[PDB]
Amino acid sequence: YIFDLFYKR
Amino acid sequence: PIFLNVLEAIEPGVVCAGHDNNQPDSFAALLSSLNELGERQLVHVVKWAKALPGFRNLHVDDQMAVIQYSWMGLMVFAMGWRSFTNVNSAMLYFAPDLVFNEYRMHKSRMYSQCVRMRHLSQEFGWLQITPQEFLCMKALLLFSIIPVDGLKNQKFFDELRMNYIKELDRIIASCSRRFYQLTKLLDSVQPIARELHQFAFDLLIKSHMVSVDFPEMMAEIISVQVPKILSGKVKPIYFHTQ
Numbered sequence: 001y002i003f004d005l006f007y008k009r
Numbered sequence: 010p011i012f013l014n015v016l017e018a019i020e021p022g023v024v025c026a027g028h029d030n031n032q033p034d035s036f037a038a039l040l041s042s043l044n045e046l047g048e049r050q051l052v053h054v055v056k057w058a059k060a061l062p063g064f065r066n067l068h069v070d071d072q073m074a075v076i077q078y079s080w081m082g083l084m085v086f087a088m089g090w091r092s093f094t095n096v097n098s099a100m101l102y103f104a105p106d107l108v109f110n111e112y113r114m115h116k117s118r119m120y121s122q123c124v125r126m127r128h129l130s131q132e133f134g135w136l137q138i139t140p141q142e143f144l145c146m147k148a149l150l151l152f153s154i155i156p157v158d159g160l161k162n163q164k165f166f167d168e169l170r171m172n173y174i175k176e177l178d179r180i181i182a183s184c185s186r187r188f189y190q191l192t193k194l195l196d197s198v199q200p201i202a203r204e205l206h207q208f209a210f211d212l213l214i215k216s217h218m219v220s221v222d223f224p225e226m227m228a229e230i231i232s233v234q235v236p237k238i239l240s241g242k243v244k245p246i247y248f249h250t251q
């Protein structure tokens with residue numbers, strides 16, 4: 001979800 | 010002294026709970042701040058870990074995984090130094106704007122767990138824990154919990170963790186006397202971590218009804234990764250058994 005997104009910013 | 014130069018150079022700053030300190034100590038308001046604090050302090054682990062000596066050595070899924078699990082244990086450990094260093098261990102120094110008093114300890118309904126945290130905070134004291142000793146134990150804490158099926162590459166991981174002991178082992182180095190104590194403390198962490206992990210999870214389910222606000226990412230980690238731990242899928246690596 002939203003953690004893996006935080007892992008490309 | 011290169012290893013150390015790094016832990017401190019990467020070492021986060023002071024995160025604020027962003028808390029309306031005017032509102033009286035309500036179970037909802039208190040915990041709707043801790044949730045943001047969880048969130049904010051999580052962002053900061055995300056960034057801190059990314060910069061660890063050979064962190065990008067690990068698998069990217071493993072990287073996320075280890076952070077997702079450790080997150081808590083770290084926040085607790087760091088928080089206890091925060092309390093120890095800033096309040097001499099009198100209260101629980103979560104953020105500048107969220108210091109926990111007996112009454113706040115009681116009002117969040119987290120009293121037992123706080124007794125635990127004031128406790129381990131008290132330990133930094135009773136054990137004359139150096140900052141270079143604290144920093145090292147905290148880095149190492151990231152490598153203190155795994156899934157039981159193992160990581161996408163356990164190999165490259167075990168490698169990592171093993172060299173984070175030799176490091177703390179070098180930072181210590183009749184040294185064995187000290188060693189034990191520190192590995193002991195580093196264990197006291199997980200028991201507590203798991204208690205908040207349980208507290209947090211209970212909350213998430215009933216948050217709909219106790220009016221306590223979880224950020225999107227907070228709920229997700231608690232909804233999808235924390236259960237893994239609670240269900241015994243993911244277990245922490247203790248030094249001594251226990």
Ligand SMILES: CC(C)(O)C(=O)Nc1ccc([N+](=O)[O-])c(C(F)(F)F)c1
Binds near residue numbers: 040081
């Ligand atoms: C989301 C849940 C209840 O708030 C939670 O883990 N609380 C929380 C929040 C922040 C911090 N912190 O270190 O600043 C901690 C704790 F690590 F002390 F336990 C717990």
